[PDB]
């Protein structure tokens, strides 16, 4: 049925076909994460609450972000919160299962 | 007289074709004559001026001067020659650009692909000259 869909939260609609050739690796860990953010705002969160902050692709969701972190960086995750900002960027905040490890991962990865 | 009707003789069309040229057509605009001796050393009569070549200025303020080509401005069709400049109120000196056709080549810069460029043109002549 045809309707204007002005109240809807998902902008996609169509179901997707198969294809003769398919793209090599698909939506995958290295497409999902963009960069970690390191500034005076973020630094407090590493020092006080054991959480990192990252920019992520618009197509990503909580479950995908959880997997991708455990694949790229290797520490285990307790929680993920998400925030669509006024500048068009999706931010993710990740809390680690043990605190203190946040300062180790941040420094190895050169975020901080 | 022109007898081919596919080629235009409109002032408006000829002018637009000049200023909006790109690619190889732009390179044709930077051609200069060779001196009498070089026209015996090589088959060619004219070539596109490049950095490092040696030129005599034959028209304008800097007539009779000789020098090395420093830079080639393709967008505003001009060449900068070593030692042709004006001094500002500040004492600071600015190179003044000369239009290609007011120059004549005295020695060729043979760096890079120049020797192959020359060979390609000589062969293209003979191919039809000998027929």
């Amino acid at each position: 049925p045809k309707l204007n869909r002005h109240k809807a939260s998902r902008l996609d609609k169509k179901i997707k076909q198969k294809k003769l050739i398919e793209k090599p690796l698909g939506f995958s860990s290295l497409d999902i994460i963009k960069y970690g953010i390191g500034h005076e705002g973020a630094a407090k969160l590493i020092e006080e609450a054991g959480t990192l902050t990252f920019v992520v692709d618009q197509r990503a969701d909580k479950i995908n972000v959880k997997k991708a972190f455990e694949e790229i960086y290797g520490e285990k995750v307790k929680k993920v919160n998400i925030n669509n900002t006024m500048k068009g960027v999706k931010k993710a905040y990740i809390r680690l299962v043990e605190l203190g490890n946040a300062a180790v991962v941040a420094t190895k990865a050169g975020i901080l | 007289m022109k007898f081919n009707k596919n080629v235009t003789a409109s002032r408006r069309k000829n002018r637009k074709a000049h200023f909006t040229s790109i690619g190889l057509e732009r390179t044709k605009l930077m051609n200069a004559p060779l001196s009498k001796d070089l026209k015996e050393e090589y088959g060619i009569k004219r070539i596109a001026v490049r950095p490092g070549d040696m030129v005599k200025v034959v028209s304008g303020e800097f007539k009779k001067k000789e020098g090395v080509v420093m830079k080639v401005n393709r967008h505003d069709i001009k060449i900068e020659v070593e030692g042709c400049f004006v001094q500002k109120e500040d004492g600071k000196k600015i190179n003044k650009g000369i239009h290609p056709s007011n120059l004549r080549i005295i020695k060729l810069s043979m760096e890079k692909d120049r020797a192959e460029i020359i060979n390609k043109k000589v062969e293209a002549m003979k191919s039809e000259v000998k027929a």
Binding site: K2, N4, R5, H6 | -
Partner: protein, 89 residues
């Protein structure tokens, strides 16, 4: 009164952005777009020649149609890896 004081009550909004044409003209209660007649299959009758030429082919990008003309000029050559399929057909 019918002038300035009645202007204060005008805080409802009957039209929103149409998903077919962009033109902020979808009437929510009627279920219809006043620019392009969505959800009807065909596009609306435009009122005059002046107004319809503003939305014709060639007013946008024409992405597909341009490529097709270049391929026709070239003789529809296809992907060079697969020449044998083309030649058989």
């Amino acid at each position: 009164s019918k002038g300035t004081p009645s202007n204060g009550k005008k805080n409802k909004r009957n039209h929103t952005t149409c998903c077919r044409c962009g033109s902020v003209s979808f009437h929510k209660q009627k279920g219809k777009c006043s620019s392009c007649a969505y959800p009807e299959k065909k596009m609306k009758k435009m009122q005059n020649r002046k107004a319809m030429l503003k939305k014709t082919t060639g007013t946008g990008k024409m992405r597909h149609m341009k490529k097709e003309r270049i391929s026709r000029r070239a003789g529809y050559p296809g992907n060079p890896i697969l020449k044998e399929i083309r030649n058989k057909i």
